Write a protein that binds this ligand. Structure first.
Ligand SMILES: [Mg+2]
Ligand SMILES: [Mg+2]
Ligand SMILES: [Mg+2]
Ligand SMILES: [Mg+2]
Ligand SMILES: [Mg+2]
Lengths: 292, 126, 208
RNA sequence: GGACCUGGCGGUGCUUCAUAUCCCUCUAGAGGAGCCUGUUCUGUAAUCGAUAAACCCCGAUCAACCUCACCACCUCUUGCUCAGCCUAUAUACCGCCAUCUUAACCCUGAUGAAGGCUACAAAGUACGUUAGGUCAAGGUGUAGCCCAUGAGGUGGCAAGAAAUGGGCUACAUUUUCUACCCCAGAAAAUUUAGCAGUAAACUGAGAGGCUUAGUUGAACAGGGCCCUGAAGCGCGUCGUCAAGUCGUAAAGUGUACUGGAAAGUGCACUU
């Protein structure tokens, strides 16, 4: 057990050590920070142990010792909080606030906070049923016409998960010296890497490493693979393609070129067509590779 | 006792198992022999064995924990952790004696770095 | 699998996406909106949006494959189709005016009908109990019977009694035989239908 | 003698589902021929046994007149060098692999044995082990024989037969050879995986049967369990001759008659 005097001595020791470390590293003690402490301790006491916690560390004592033992009453013995005798003053105070806001509203993507992190915020252990109670109250608050204050209150208890599918980065439309518009893109399949330039206007000529596509790809399967992107969006014979492919084999190179042409052609089609190509599997890098 | 009736302080090195040697523990000896391309790893191992036995027999009941044997160039540093039970005069005597024996036995400048502690620094209880 | 469970199979149909928003049901509309969120797998080498694509012929080619040699399997398939086309043109040019209206020259129609004529309706499944495997008649699923027609055709064409007759010519002849309800594959279908009627004692076990 | 309580069955079955491994189905390949090994029988005095120890100088290989090993006869002796043997022992240790084991507090029952849950909440809170393998990429010892467990010489030994287990080669027309790297011309039953860049086919790099880098690229993808998981119901609460030195896993209560009585029927009652 750590007495408050012990923690006080630890704080003053840590401050003296902070100024000492600033002295050793030549930095200004006034602006010396915790990240600087971490970097300096890493330099002066190098350690390659895989366990991140096992390395030498200099933390502020409150970070090290468990300081959740906050006193809930003063010298006279009167508890500070009017819900102290419930034993769950934080949780029930929060429930009281939520109920009051629901009363006020009655008179007038993202995920819910988990149980353990809710305990961490409240600094109080709570069961599952009371967590469910709180979440149902939060749902009720959301369904009602919650205002800006209520919206941010809910956001205090709503964690963030990012969803960013549907959005294919559309490469910029560049212009060559002759004034013609084109777009460049890259693709990869197994060890084959392709880089294609699709022109806005053309007559359907594909040129692979400076060779016509039927001469570079004798097999019909690869020519069908090259045809698939333009055929899908009904623009066969309307663009010129100049691509450079390297590595891999016959089918891997054909697949890399197909991916590159689809990603470059996304510049000259409508957003609905881009989404359709995405759903047809034409804009996804195939990750299947030889396993050791 | 009875057959179904069946059905110790430890320091950090004692507590943690061998599969933590590069995760939580470290290496007691530090030298270049085991690196790729370097030679004489076995000779360093034999030297380490002799150092450990010699030190454990020359400081009996004093070493609180295991030695740390560092090597830089031809230097040989023994960083030991001992107890505050033996008198400092005897510690100085033994430091001088051990330094000179090991320097003349290994033909290198050996040096020794006692760190006394009041008692064994127990990590946990197993 | 290198794909996460999140990734979904792609839909290569080209006329599905052009379906006007008006014809969309609320359910189909919801599915269309849901696919917007999902991750989709890269389309595999093989099926494309081409109008000459035929999944049945692709599966037949894959079933003739040996050692990953797809070029050779497709070469054999196209040689077989060409041979069927040429034989039907030969028969059509030598036929009377009234026999020409009933000579099929499309090799794809012939291939599909020949495989359809070889599909069995009933098969046998062994079941284990008592140490004795029991052979119960079973109505075959559509996938199983479509697979069995192809497997029987390919095994019939791989028979070693056909010495130095090249696979395209054997396969075209077998396909044209099956198109007319003749040949050994139709007989193999009949000998399973008879060996499933010979064992109607256990005909009602519905839990194979 | 009356009332009450704890229980315990190292218990017994079933029910439903999660039921993944494991199934079963389903998919794709794996039997003939020639040699080499395992076991058995038969046979010999005997070993169709081995080459840091022959041969060969494409690979491998059989017996080789090599040599060791075996069988039948002999010889040598202080000799090699205070000689000589790879003969034993890790059933000596070390090393290297592997096996197995690893309390308090608060309430209720009148302060009895005793009991304490309801969430729209009603008292509950806190290392050893091993007759182990390895004496080929390694050691430290200990024992053995020393007219022989050493050194030689003369002959022989060189097996036979089945049924099955395993291994190595070739096994083609979707093939083979050339040019090319794919539009040419000439020739002729168990078992192993499955679950995808996987199976199958084909190339390169290494340390010198094992480690890494590539190319092409499939088929099938349905029903139920063992077993833990999730719970629920029920049941169940042995006998005997002298104790084991014994054996074994609609229903009732009365009464009357009963001569086809392992209990039945008749009459009256109870739930
Ligand atoms: Mg022999
Ligand atoms: Mg010898
Ligand atoms: Mg042993
Ligand atoms: Mg009677
Ligand atoms: Mg009676």
């Amino acid at each position: 057990t750590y007495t408050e005097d012990f923690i006080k001595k630890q704080i003053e020791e840590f401050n003296i050590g902070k100024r000492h470390l600033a002295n050793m590293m030549g930095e200004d003690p006034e602006t010396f920070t915790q990240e600087d402490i971490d970097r300096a301790i890493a330099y002066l006491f190098p350690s390659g142990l895989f366990e991140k916690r096992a390395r030498p560390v200099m933390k502020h004592p409150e970070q090290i010792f468990p300081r959740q033992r906050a006193i809930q009453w003063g010298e006279d013995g009167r508890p500070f909080h009017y819900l102290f005798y419930t034993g769950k003053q934080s949780y029930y105070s929060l429930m009281h606030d939520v109920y009051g806001m629901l009363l006020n509203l009655e008179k007038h993507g993202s995920r819910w906070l988990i149980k353990e992190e809710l305990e961490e915020m409240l600094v109080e252990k709570l069961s599952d049923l009371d967590y469910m109670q709180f979440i149902r109250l939060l749902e009720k608050l959301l369904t009602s016409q919650c205002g800006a204050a209520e919206e941010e209150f809910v956001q205090r208890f709503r964690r963030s998960v990012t969803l960013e599918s549907k959005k294919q980065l559309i490469e910029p439309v560049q212009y060559d010296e002759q004034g013609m518009a084109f777009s460049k893109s890259e693709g990869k399949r197994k060890t084959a890497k392709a880089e294609a330039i699709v022109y806005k206007h053309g007559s359907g000529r594909i040129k692979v490493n400076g060779i016509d596509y039927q001469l570079y790809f004798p097999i019909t399967q690869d020519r069908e693979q090259l045809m698939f992107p333009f055929h899908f969006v009904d623009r066969l014979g309307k663009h010129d393609v100049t691509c450079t492919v390297s590595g891999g084999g016959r089918s891997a190179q054909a697949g890399a070129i197909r991916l590159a042409m689809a990603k470059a052609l996304c510049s000259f089609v409508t957003e609905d067509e881009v989404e359709w190509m995405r759903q047809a599997g034409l804009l996804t890098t195939d990750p299947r590779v030889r396993e050791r | 006792r009875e057959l179904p009736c069946a059905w110790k302080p430890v320091t950090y090195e004692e507590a943690h198992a061998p599969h933590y040697i590069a995760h939580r523990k470290g290496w007691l000896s530090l030298h270049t022999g085991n690196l790729d391309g370097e030679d004489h790893a076995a000779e360093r191992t034999v030297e380490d064995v002799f150092l450990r036995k010699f030190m454990w027999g020359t400081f009996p009941g004093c070493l609180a924990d295991q030695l740390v044997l560092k090597r830089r160039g031809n230097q040989l540093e023994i960083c030991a952790v001992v107890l505050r039970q033996l008198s400092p005069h005897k510690y100085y005597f033994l430091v001088g004696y051990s330094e000179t024996l090991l320097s003349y036995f290994y033909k290198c400048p050996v040096r020794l770095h006692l760190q006394t502690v009041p008692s064994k620094v127990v990590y946990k209880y197993l | 699998s290198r794909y996460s469970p999140e990734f979904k199979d792609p839909l290569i149909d080209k006329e599905y996406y052009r379906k006007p928003v008006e014809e969309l049901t609320e359910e189909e509309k919801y599915v269309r909106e849901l696919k917007k969120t999902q991750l989709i797998k890269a389309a595999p080498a093989g099926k494309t949006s081409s109008v000459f694509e035929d999944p049945v012929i692709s599966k037949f080619t894959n079933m003739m494959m040996i050692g990953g040699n797809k070029v050779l399997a497709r070469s054999l398939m196209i040689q077989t189709l060409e041979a069927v086309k040429r034989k039907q043109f030969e028969k059509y040019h030598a036929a009377s005016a009234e026999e020409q209206a009933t000579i099929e020259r499309n090799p794809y129609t012939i291939f599909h009908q020949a495989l359809k004529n070889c599909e069995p309706m009933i098969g046998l499944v062994p079941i284990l109990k008592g140490g004795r495997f029991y052979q119960v008649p079973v109505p075959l699923p559509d996938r199983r019977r479509r697979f069995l027609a192809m497997k029987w055709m390919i095994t019939e064409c791989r028979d070693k009694k056909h010495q130095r007759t090249l696979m395209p010519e054997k396969l075209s002849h077998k396909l044209l035989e099956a198109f007319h309800n003749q040949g050994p594959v139709i007989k193999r279908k009949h000998d399973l239908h008879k060996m499933a009627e010979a064992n109607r004692a256990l005909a009602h076990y519905r839990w194979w």
